[PDB]
Design a protein around this ligand. Structure first.
Ligand SMILES: [K+]
Lengths: 120, 114
């Protein structure tokens, strides 16, 4: 379960972005193909004892979290990186979801492998 | 034109200014970046915690046609980045499979020619 995910309007991710429910709370992520691992920036719930080097310093992985998508749920663990401006959905989750990112001129859409809305 | 020229997936290799450049396709980047011998630089620049110069315009060769684009010259970046500016110009789509990804045009065709 996550704690407070509020205050994102102070540093909103740019598009492509997607809001998902993670551990019971809505989180708006930048969908970031440049990130190997997905990241929560605040109140991430309990942390495992495992950590990763982020190039740079070391941060802990969360335990498994439920990730609510428009039409299904997945389990995923995130790095807790407070020194990041916003939550990132990185390649680990993109590959797991077989997500597609579509650019439009007017911004970007993030959909599932069948074009389904992912965003809650 | 570029002078003498590894990113993780999603990677794409494009001819830019006459030279092949392998880019990370980076939705986290506002601006596209060249890191090495980027050819003539403009007098315009962007803050990124640092200020870097834009290149003058460069022909970018895609399977979908050619486009003109200026890149930020950022040597202190580990690899060239194809950022949201170009992805939007191209109406590109990035499709993930389990172990990788494909970068494709507005109608499903691969963008890379090489
Ligand atoms: K939020």
């Amino acid at each position: 379960t996550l704690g407070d995910q509020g205050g994102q309007g102070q540093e909103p991710p740019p598009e492509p972005r997607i809001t998902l429910k993670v551990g019971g709370q809505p989180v708006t992520f930048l969908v970031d193909t440049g990130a190997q691992h997905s990241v929560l920036t605040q109140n991430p719930g309990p942390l495992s004892d495992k950590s990763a080097w982020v190039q740079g310093k070391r941060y802990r992985w969360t335990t498994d979290r439920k990730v609510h998508l428009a039409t299904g749920k997945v389990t995923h663990s995130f790095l807790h990186v407070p020194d990041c401006p916003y939550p990132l959905l990185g390649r680990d989750l993109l590959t797991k979801l077989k997500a597609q990112i579509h650019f439009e001129g007017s911004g970007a859409q993030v959909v599932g492998p069948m074009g389904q809305p992912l965003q809650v």
